[PDB]
Ligand binder design. Structure first.
Ligand code: HEM
Ligand code: HEM
Ligand SMILES: [Ca+2]
Length: 304
């Protein structure tokens, strides 16, 4: 069939989001370290101001992102960039890492550890989640708990996963079309894999110009690479591109049939393709809001 072959094909070029959180190297999972990681992820006491947590910009009930064109949350950033989703971030390859870069932006490791040492409940959770350690309340221990909570922030069973799994009836007519167009148009070169993307860097980026106020450019000439985003849950993580300038997901497909790629796109193939991309929305994780423990007289105060 022309099917059993879009489908035996895709089965090859993509893997589904696994049932369970993956293993992190150096950093075993446990109910307690996951509880701890989640407490921290939601605690705005990690910012010097007591105003920002990771959820502020990576909102688990609104697709893992912040709905904003751009923001600055990591110290390595040369200015506002669009916040990627935390959802399925663990599968990407995109004190060097996300928690540390965040903390050193809004705080110093020092005040963060003074803050955690200051609350008995947190000390006690650090001791359960990292046992047999003399001093388990460390900057590095804290990032590791958060990472193990992040690892649970995956979205199994989108219509597409249910398709690579077997079921052809998981995609509809217009999304099965869309797919073929996605492969056929080479889409899957740059945005394929376990995570449809999150994996390569390309001398390719969306730009203003000083039907298509926006389009692609070659930045080889500037030794500038951008990573090619995971496309999972993209229907829920607008606006689009590093600068968050495209709001319509149809547009964003129309900006990505660039000359620069050897790809032409019809207004109706973009359509088909946006409707394929809709299929990439998985089951949103179920998070019980953490009950974070009260500060004590010893806890540093908001700083200004
Ligand atoms: C400790 C709390 C946070 C955690 C655990 C966390 C997690 C992450 C991760 C995992 C990434 C990169 C994702 C990937 O490679 O798939 C990231 C990037 C990003 N986040 Fe956060 N995040 C936190 C706080 C924030 C905050 C508070 C903001 C505030 C405005 C923010 C805005 C952004 C931006 C703009 C990026 C991308 C930076 C770049 O690509 O250069 N994040 N975060
Ligand atoms: C028709 C096929 C393609 C489609 C539908 C497509 C779709 C998309 C979408 C929807 C985004 C925005 C995701 C977000 O903002 O989270 C994006 C960004 C991006 N993709 Fe494409 N893409 C295609 C082909 C390609 C190719 C061939 C490459 C290799 C050169 C590539 C690499 C990239 C890069 C580097 C970005 C980031 C641009 C920026 O943030 O400024 N993609 N794509
Ligand atoms: Ca976005």
């Amino acid at each position: 069939f022309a099917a059993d072959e879009l489908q035996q094909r895709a089965q090859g070029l993509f893997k589904p989001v696994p049932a369970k959180a993956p293993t992190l190297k150096g950093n075993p999972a446990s109910p307690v370290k996951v509880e701890l990681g989640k407490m921290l992820y939601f605690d705005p006491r990690l910012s010097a101001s007591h105003l920002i947590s990771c959820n502020t910009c990576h909102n688990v009930g609104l697709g893992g992102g912040d709905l904003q064109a751009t923001s600055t949350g990591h110290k390595w950033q040369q200015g506002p960039i669009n916040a990627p989703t935390v959802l399925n971030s663990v599968f990407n390859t995109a004190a060097k890492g996300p928690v540390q870069a965040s903390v050193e932006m809004n705080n110093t490791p020092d005040q963060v550890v003074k803050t955690l040492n200051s609350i008995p409940d947190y000390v006690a959770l650090f001791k359960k989640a990292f046992p047999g350690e003399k001093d388990p309340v460390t900057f590095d221990n804290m990032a590791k708990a958060i990472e193990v909570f992040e690892a649970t922030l995956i979205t199994p069973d989108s219509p597409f996963d249910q398709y690579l799994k077997g079921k052809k009836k998981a995609l509809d007519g217009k999304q099965t079309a869309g797919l073929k167009l996605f492969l056929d148009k080479g889409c899957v070169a740059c945005h394929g894999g376990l995570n449809l993307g999150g994996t390569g860097y390309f001398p390719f980026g969306v730009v203003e110009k000083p039907k298509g106020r926006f389009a692609v450019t070659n930045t080889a000439k500037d030794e500038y690479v951008f990573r090619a985003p995971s496309l999972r849950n993209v229907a829920i993580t607008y606006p689009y591109f590093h600068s968050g300038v495209v709001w319509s997901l149809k547009e964003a497909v129309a900006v990505m049939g660039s000359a620069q790629f050897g790809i032409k796109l019809s207004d109706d193939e973009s359509e088909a393709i946006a409707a394929f991309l809709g299929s990439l929305t998985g089951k949103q994780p179920k998070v019980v809001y953490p009950i974070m423990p009260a500060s004590t007289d010893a806890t540093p105060r908001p700083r200004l």
